[PDB]
Amino acid sequence: DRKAVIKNADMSEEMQQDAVDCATQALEKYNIEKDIAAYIKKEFDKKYNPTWHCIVGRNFGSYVTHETRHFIYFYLGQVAILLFKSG
Amino acid sequence: DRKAVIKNADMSEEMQQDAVDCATQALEKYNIEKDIAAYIKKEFDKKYNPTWHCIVGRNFGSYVTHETRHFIYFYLGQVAILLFKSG
């Protein structure tokens, strides 16, 4: 099982833990990046209200405008996950 | 120079061309993914109003909620670019 490394976050500690949990569940269920991303996005829309956006990959870079306290960029093993609400 | 392949788009033809042009300029200037993404995002905020978000990589997958007519996912060579406004 996979090592969580949080790279950048503007998010409550409890929500960061839910993000890691959600992504862990997603990787258990799915192997294709877009399917992993959709699972996480949908779960966060449910738990923490719409509207979330999720990117899953390895090496991608990003520049997004996020809502205060609704942003995380982290790795689970070698898989990078960006999850945020837009500002 | 790089071959443009548009994978998915919900965007005017003129705006798609500007996206390809912007990304071409970005790749001429910068080598690091997050810097490429920031250039494109900033140019689209200027030309087509805030608020855009941009991901640059190779193999990433995504699931985002986009504003009608403000979404493109395309490749320039092997570089994948996602550019959208949130719905």
CB contact under 8 A, A63 and B86: no
User: Please, how many CA atoms are within 13 Å of residue A35, restricted to the half-sphere of its CB?
Assistant: 8
Residue type, B55: I
For tokens 């965007």, what's the residue? B11
Closest CA to A51 of B70, B38, B63, B69: B63
Query: Domains (ranges, CATH) in chain A?
Result: 1-87 (3.30.740.10)
Residue type, A14: E
CB atoms within 10 A of CB A71: 19
- A→B contacts (Cβ < 8 Å), by residue, are 32-38, 40-42, 50-65, 80, 82, 86-87
* Resolution value (Å, 1 decimal): 1.7
Chain B positions touching A35 (Cβ under 8 A) are: 61
DSSP state of A78: T
Cis omega (within 30 of 0) for bond into B51: yes
Cα-based distances in Å from A69 to A8, A16, A50, B70: 12, 10, 14, 25
For tokens 């689970």, what's the residue? A76
CA distance B65 to A65: 14
In sequence order, what DSSP letters do the residues of A23-69 get, joined into one string? Answer: HHHHHHH--SHHHHHHHHHHHHHHHH-S-EEEEEESS-EEE--EEEE
DSSP state of A9: E
Which neighbouring-strand residues pair with A54?
A83, B63
Cα-based distances in Å from B38 to A31, A36, A39, A59, A83: 29, 25, 27, 16, 17
Contact residues for A77 (Cβ-Cβ < 8 A; gap 6+): A2, A3
DSSP state of A77: T
* Test the B interface: residue of A44, A46, A54, A62 with most B CBs within 10 Å: A62
